[PDB]
């Protein structure tokens, strides 16, 4: 048999991880956020 | 005897700030909601 072997292969690329993000130039202190300890006040 | 009154003592800014600190720290420790 001339075709002594016929090696099959499967190939799969990986996926790309993406996220949705907000931004806005005019606004509040927290510009954008992804879609109660309050220890933040204590230092002042 | 613990004398929490602290009567034979005086200060104006030290005691005012201490009162402020007491309240702010006590509330902060409650908010931590520790399960301990």
UniProtKB/Swiss-Prot annotation, chain A:
Tissue: Expressed in chondrocytes (at protein level).
Localization, UniProt: Cell projection, Cilium; Cytoplasm, Cytoskeleton, Microtubule organizing center, Centrosome
Similarity comment text for this entry: Belongs to the dynein light intermediate chain family.
Quaternary structure (record): Intermediate chain of the cytoplasmic dynein complex 2, a multisubunit complex, composed at least of eleven different proteins. The cytoplasmic dynein 2 complex consists of two catalytic heavy chains (HCs) and a number of non-catalytic subunits presented by intermediate chains (ICs), light intermediate chains (LICs) and light chains (LCs).
Role played: Acts as one of several non-catalytic accessory components of the cytoplasmic dynein 2 complex (dynein-2 complex), a motor protein complex that drives the movement of cargos along microtubules within cilia and flagella in concert with the intraflagellar transport (IFT) system. DYNC2I1 plays a major role in retrograde ciliary protein trafficking in cilia and flagella. Also requires to maintain a functional transition zone.
Disease affiliated with this protein: Short-rib thoracic dysplasia 8 with or without polydactyly: A form of short-rib thoracic dysplasia, a group of autosomal recessive ciliopathies that are characterized by a constricted thoracic cage, short ribs, shortened tubular bones, and a 'trident' appearance of the acetabular roof. Polydactyly is variably present. Non-skeletal involvement can include cleft lip/palate as well as anomalies of major organs such as the brain, eye, heart, kidneys, liver, pancreas, intestines, and genitalia.
Name by which UniProt lists this protein: Cytoplasmic dynein 2 intermediate chain 1
Gene: DYNC2I1
Part of the full-length chain shown: 534 to 582 of 1066
Swiss-Prot record, chain B:
Transmembrane segments: none
Expression by tissue: Expressed in bone, brain, kidney, and cartilage. Lower expression in heart, liver, lung, placenta and thymus.
Subcellular location: Golgi apparatus; Cytoplasm; Cell projection, Cilium; Cytoplasm, Cytoskeleton, Cilium basal body
Disorder named in the UniProt entry: Short-rib thoracic dysplasia 15 with polydactyly: A form of short-rib thoracic dysplasia, a group of autosomal recessive ciliopathies that are characterized by a constricted thoracic cage, short ribs, shortened tubular bones, and a 'trident' appearance of the acetabular roof. Polydactyly is variably present. Non-skeletal involvement can include cleft lip/palate as well as anomalies of major organs such as the brain, eye, heart, kidneys, liver, pancreas, intestines, and genitalia.
Subunit structure: Light intermediate chain of the cytoplasmic dynein complex 2, a multisubunit complex composed at least of eleven different proteins. The cytoplasmic dynein 2 complex consists of two catalytic heavy chains (HCs) and a number of non-catalytic subunits presented by intermediate chains (ICs), light intermediate chains (LICs) and light chains (LCs).
Family: Belongs to the dynein light intermediate chain family.
Protein name as annotated: Cytoplasmic dynein 2 light intermediate chain 1
Organism of provenance: Homo sapiens (Human)
Included stretch of the parent chain: 308 to 343 of 351
């Amino acid at each position: 048999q001339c075709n002594e072997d016929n090696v099959e292969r499967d190939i799969q690329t990986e996926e790309i991880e993406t996220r949705e993000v907000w931004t806005q130039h005019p606004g509040e202190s927290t510009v954008v956020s992804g879609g109660t300890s309050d220890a933040v006040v204590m230092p002042k | 005897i613990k004398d929490p009154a602290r009567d034979p003592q005086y200060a104006e800014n030290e005691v005012d700030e201490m009162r402020i600190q007491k309240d702010l720290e006590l509330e902060q420790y409650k908010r931590s909601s520790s399960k301990s």
